[PDB]
Amino acid sequence: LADKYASGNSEISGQELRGLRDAIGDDASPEDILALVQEKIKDPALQSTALDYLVQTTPPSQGKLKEALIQARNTHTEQFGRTAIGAKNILFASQEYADQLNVSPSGLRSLYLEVTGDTHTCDQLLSMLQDRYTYQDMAIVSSFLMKGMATELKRQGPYVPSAQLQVLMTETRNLQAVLTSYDYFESRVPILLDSLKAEGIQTPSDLNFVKVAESYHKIINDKFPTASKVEREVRNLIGDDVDSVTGVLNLFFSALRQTSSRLFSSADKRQQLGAMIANALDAVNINN
Ligand SMILES: [Cl-]
Ligand SMILES: [Cl-]
Ligand SMILES: [Cl-]
Ligand SMILES: [Cl-]
């Protein structure tokens, strides 16, 4: 039934599916069929969905038509590949998350196909997304990406690059942890900067939580960090006032404690970084 096939799909109605069915004659060619599907349905994922409905609900009396519909669907899949099938696989997730975000489901499916169409590291995902979404919305988008990928791994098929998706899920999980980290900086950085300003300590006026968080992540990802290289990172960020430098170092030490256990290679590595930061705090006081 068209209503059943359209149930819970916010982008196609039962009426639209029945209309398409009724417009397709018994002797329609595959080309005729695709022309009508294209006219009535704009998005390739939804076209593919409509084609599944048409094939599946053509009765035996219309054997010729069923064959033509199967050919039409095969041609559509030949045309689009993963662009149709991958998007179709995540249709309902895209609708759920589009509702959350108040955006188009199709735009989310395009983003999903962009993310899943290449290797991306966490850094690359952050860079793509931060120009397109607020940090708050990035967290929601990350949940969408995770849900979509898990759905495709459940579905399998030639247009699902399962091993690639597994790696992207690891990197997305990493992104989620980075976003949580950024929330700590978003809370604390304005407080620190306002506190310094209230005591007449000048800090660069373009310094914000993102820049501070970027410096912290650079330190935890450095293959050869040292106490001196942490202190220098901080001085490059906020300048040379002893209280400014101390405040950022304490903030980094606190951030370390709370960072996920996926953004370090081991608990030993996290401890080593903490000891470096503590050594930098001591150095800053000695040299004051
Ligand atoms: Cl058209
Ligand atoms: Cl196929
Ligand atoms: Cl949109
Ligand atoms: Cl997290």
Give structural notes.
- With 288 residues, the protein is mostly helical.
- It has three domains: 1-80, no CATH class; 81-179, no CATH class; 180-288, no CATH class.
- It contains 15 helices and no strands.
- The chain has helices spanning 2-6, 14-23, 30-40, 44-56, 63-80, 82-89, 91-101, 105-116, 122-130, 135-155, 162-198, 209-220, 227-238, 242-258, 267-286.
- Helix 11 runs antiparallel to helix 14 (242-258) and helix 12 packs antiparallel against helix 13.
- The termini are far apart.
- The protein binds chloride ion (4 copies).
- The site of one chloride ion has 2 residues, from helix 5.
- It comes from Chlamydia pneumoniae (Chlamydophila pneumoniae).
- Residues 1-133 form the Hypersensitivity response secretion-like HrpJ domain.
- The modification N6-methyllysine is found at residues 154, 218, 229, 269.
Summarize the helices and strands and which ones pair or pack.
Layout: H1 2-6, H2 14-23, H3 30-40, H4 44-56, H5 63-80, H6 82-89, H7 91-101, H8 105-116, H9 122-130, H10 135-155, H11 162-198, H12 209-220, H13 227-238, H14 242-258, H15 267-286
Helix pairs in contact: 3-5, 4-5, 4-6, 6-8, 7-8, 7-10, 8-10, 9-11, 10-11, 11-12, 11-14, 12-13, 13-14, 13-15, 14-15
Bound molecules: chloride ion (4 copies).
Modified residues (N6,N6-dimethyllysine): 147, 154
GO biological process, one term: protein secretion by the type III secretion system
Domain T3SS low calcium response E C-terminal helical: 184-282
